[PDB]
Design a protein around this ligand. Sequence first.
Ligand SMILES: [Mn+2]
Lengths: 344, 95
Amino acid sequence: LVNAGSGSIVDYVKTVLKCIRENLNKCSCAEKIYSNEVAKVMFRVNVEKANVEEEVKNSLEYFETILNEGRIIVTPAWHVSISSALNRGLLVELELVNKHKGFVIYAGGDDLLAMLPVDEVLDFIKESRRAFAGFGTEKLGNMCLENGFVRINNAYYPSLPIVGRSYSVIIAHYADPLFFVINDSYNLLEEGKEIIRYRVMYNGEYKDAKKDVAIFRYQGLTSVIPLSLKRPIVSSVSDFNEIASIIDVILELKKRIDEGRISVSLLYDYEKYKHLIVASDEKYLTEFLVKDWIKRNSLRKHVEFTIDEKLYGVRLTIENYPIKIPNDLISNIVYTLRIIYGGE
Amino acid sequence: PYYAFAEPFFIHAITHLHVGSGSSVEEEIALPFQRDELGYPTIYASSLKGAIKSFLLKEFPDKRDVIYKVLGEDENPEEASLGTFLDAILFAIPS
Ligand SMILES: [Mn+2]
């Protein structure tokens, strides 16, 4: 609310909110806020009438309703803005799919149902989840998304940088019956997003979180990759890059495994380090531990690719479902690698 | 006769041999030998087959079709191999 204003008006609204703060008063704090509103009407030369009695009371009553109910009161402009941004993000994702040799079955606004090669699925997931939040570097036709908005030749249309987004991936044999393939895709993307909890901190406190993940499945293997690790998934221009940050790590690691700098034994050798590292309790200890686990399959001479130290302590939970999952994000990273390869 | 021929044989080590273990087991030795279910050293017939086949494909460069038939084609297989290797049991060790 206080940020929604542009101009000296923000002072009035935040001091009203302070009058709403801690059940402070009505009919009483309507002076401090008013000794500025009347100041403002006297700050001009042609004002006609003021019923500040009614007006500041209604202005406080608005925010009081907002907070008591607990939701921004929706007006038609809200709906048409969300829907327009939905369609524009859809236009972005249409050429994001086409950027990765994909075939759209249904891409409409919020959702998506495409078919891509098993090779560029991770790239597409990353770039799509970022473009949904208006954060990208490509021109996608006539549309050049810019850090939370959608620039279209000087037109800055909004985006959905607050809305999370889940992702299901089914690595399927071309002879697999599409009935069960589509049903498994839908049932993962439904069950899992409601049923999984992964560690997140907002306000500096390790809490849980449910949506905005990426589930993978390969004929029995499953993995989940959290996409935000922040509950106001972005609130600054800073956190725009944090989106899908775990995915570029998996992409880099797959970039090392292919070129023959790491051996796929990496994907079968993390279990022994996992006991040590999840009971481990210091940062740089676990840092060196993963560095040397990789440095038994080697990544490089004079190692250069470490895991970015935000990935540890992240524990993924599940509400006791047949979907078995490792309780930690790095084991899920390596299962995502197993699932991607298993389809190549 | 499920099997046409049965060729039991001994494997006398000429030098010291090292068939490595494939395992996520953390052991003391960095590179241990292959172990059977009793912890004795053994040679997985996977390793017997791979090595003996890689050798035969060179000693007898003309009969590569007989070998590819009895021990399976390499890069584009259409059929099951006709020969089977049993895992090598330890039989006697020098002390
Ligand atoms: Mn749903």
